[PDB]
Design a protein around this ligand. Sequence first.
Ligand SMILES: C[C@@H]1Nc2nc(N)[nH]c(=O)c2N2CN(c3ccc(C[C@H](O)[C@H](O)[C@H](O)CO[C@H]4O[C@H](COP(=O)(O)O[C@@H](CCC(=O)O)C(=O)O)[C@@H](O)[C@H]4O)cc3)[C@H](C)[C@@H]12
Ligand SMILES: C[C@@H]1Nc2nc(N)[nH]c(=O)c2N2CN(c3ccc(C[C@H](O)[C@H](O)[C@H](O)CO[C@H]4O[C@H](COP(=O)(O)O[C@@H](CCC(=O)O)C(=O)O)[C@@H](O)[C@H]4O)cc3)[C@H](C)[C@@H]12
Lengths: 344, 344
Amino acid sequence: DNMKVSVYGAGNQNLYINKLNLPEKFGGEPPYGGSRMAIEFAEAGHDVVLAEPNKNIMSDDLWKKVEDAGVKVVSDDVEAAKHGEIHVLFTPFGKATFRIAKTIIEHVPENAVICNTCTVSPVVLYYSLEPILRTKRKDVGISSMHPAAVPGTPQHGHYVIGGKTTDGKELATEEQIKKAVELAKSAGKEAYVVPADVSSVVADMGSLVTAVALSGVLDYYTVGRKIINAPKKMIEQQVIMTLQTMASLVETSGIEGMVKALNPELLIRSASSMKLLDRQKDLDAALEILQNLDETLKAEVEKAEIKPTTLVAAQSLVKEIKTLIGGAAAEGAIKRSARKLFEH
Amino acid sequence: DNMKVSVYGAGNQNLYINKLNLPEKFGGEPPYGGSRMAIEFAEAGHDVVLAEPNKNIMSDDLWKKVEDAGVKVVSDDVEAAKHGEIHVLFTPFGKATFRIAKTIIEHVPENAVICNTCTVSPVVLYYSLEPILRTKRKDVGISSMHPAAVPGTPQHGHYVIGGKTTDGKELATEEQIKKAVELAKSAGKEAYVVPADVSSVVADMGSLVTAVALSGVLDYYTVGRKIINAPKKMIEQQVIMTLQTMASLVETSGIEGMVKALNPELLIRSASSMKLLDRQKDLDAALEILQNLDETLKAEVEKAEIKPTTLVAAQSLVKEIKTLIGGAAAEGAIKRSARKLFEH
Ligand SMILES: C[C@@H]1Nc2nc(N)[nH]c(=O)c2N2CN(c3ccc(C[C@H](O)[C@H](O)[C@H](O)CO[C@H]4O[C@H](COP(=O)(O)O[C@@H](CCC(=O)O)C(=O)O)[C@@H](O)[C@H]4O)cc3)[C@H](C)[C@@H]12
Ligand SMILES: C[C@@H]1Nc2nc(N)[nH]c(=O)c2N2CN(c3ccc(C[C@H](O)[C@H](O)[C@H](O)CO[C@H]4O[C@H](COP(=O)(O)O[C@@H](CCC(=O)O)C(=O)O)[C@@H](O)[C@H]4O)cc3)[C@H](C)[C@@H]12
């Protein structure tokens, strides 16, 4: 099989080459990112169009690598939309990504699948398109194609594909997901389907936060259960509270407001009493980081406002709202509030 | 001051002394915990009653120390309830803490304040007593006096006292909070008033998780802003999604189910691509912890089921339901669902 593929966004080569210095710290050669995905798809035998309105995003020498792979470059998103069975958004954060999705949705061929990469959760992308998806384009699927690294670097060995959500919702058909998986595999990459509501947390840049937070949770779980012999329910409740409270404070007050609310000084004193083993290098690392915060950050923390934040049991609250106003209205509330934070 | 003080629970001296070996691992001398708080309050000149139904919870020699400090020991919670203006729950996790609170609430004097320590959040404690607090005992306040260390150890130098919530709820009066603060200070401890909805996250056992997750958030924030120059709102959105998704997964599926959903292997690969700096010892510690997981933990993770979990924007959803069903009904929903997770 070979497919018609559309990739949207060449990727910021100045970022990859000069900011991240990928060629020398990670490996490979430019171009990286979206234009590299297109190259790899074309070398896999696919019929590839790359949509990039900004010709200045890379030198002619790098554009040439793209053209030699057999990628057809267009400046018009709509032309790319009519071309592909599968559409890969390597698009700039924010309005650009949502704008491009909304631009192409009424032009993509029957049964097309639209996949986000780094820039947005597929559930959020789905929500932003839901009024069209539920009416005029019930054929179109939403998935994702998250690289494990920057495409073009040696470290990129797989894709995470957003599949059926943990609560059983299908954003794309099984056939559309299998086409996404086969597009990944055809490039010599591993391809893993992950529930779409979880996928961006394990593959986006914030996976940094996921890994470090998870390491603290497992540290506390181990120490709690094996040293302290704390009840498992107690440990889990405190974990939920910590993560939920931090999430909510960032949502209302930003990073600096959340730090102001938790108070690192206090936190360091308190967490110090949880040093039961020297095997806890995560706690060791955290304590030194919190004691040496960048100086401009601390100034902005003092200036920050802690906004009204409500303590909740989030999944329990979802169930409660369903019992009060019904499944349909509850889902409407969940969708509107998700779009307000993650889309605008 | 000659404040009337009631403390509930002597503390598990077998755990502190014989299991954890605090005298040699931390310092100080037994007794520790609730009975030590009682001793310190009594030595500060307060009129202290300690309620402990189980005389076998410490040796006779340790009881003599409590008694020589002038602490009056009673086995009946109701008698201690009638005594104190301030009531300190050093009570076993779960039904015990809630049971003792419900036992004393209808017997405590006019204007008394009831304070949790390690075992429960003051907001949850308030929710569990709310049916009585709203009607018969609108005079009674709820606060906390969390030692953020084990009382009796050198590390215990302060108390975290839960004050007005970030969203403006006063669970105790200014006069009741001032008593908790003076009780702390008269005992030589510093006293930090912190919004009650945040207090346990900064002082509980789970402060280990708070400190480690926060260091990961600040790591990502620094790398995001200063290396990648990612939009601040993108970074904050990803932090929120990560922390929320983890909280929600633990809530529906337990720690092992959450681990199964996030998939350590994928996470490790992805987070490795975010290793941009030698400054990131939090990320370093995390990668070694996750890649060297206990084999019985890894077995229990694969056996775990991932339960239906709903992607939400929690604070946005709270605002959404307040407008949808009104402030009073939304607060009822938040109260009932919080109790369902954290009390029942
Ligand atoms: C090294 C990392 N490792 C990973 N590791 C893992 N595991 N997963 C990953 O995804 C990554 N990475 C993905 N990476 C990654 C992903 C996103 C961005 C974000 C970009 O650096 C950009 O900051 C955003 O995409 C937004 O930039 C975008 O901003 C403009 C849109 O504004 P606009 O012009 O539409 O708005 C107007 C409004 C003006 C008004 O208010 O009127 C304007 O400002 O003019 C776009 O043109 C582009 O510049 C950076 C790096 C890293 C390369 C990479
Ligand atoms: C070293 C740590 N550093 C800190 N550092 C910081 N920053 N913050 C902290 O809070 C702490 N710590 C607080 N710590 C801490 C706090 C709670 C627990 C957990 C408690 O130990 C739990 O409350 C017990 O595990 C409950 O279970 C204990 O009680 C059971 C009896 O059955 P039951 O509870 O069902 O019986 C009822 C009787 C009902 C009746 O009386 O009718 C009851 O609850 O009494 C016992 O078998 C034992 O497992 C452990 C350690 C650590 C010592 C300490």
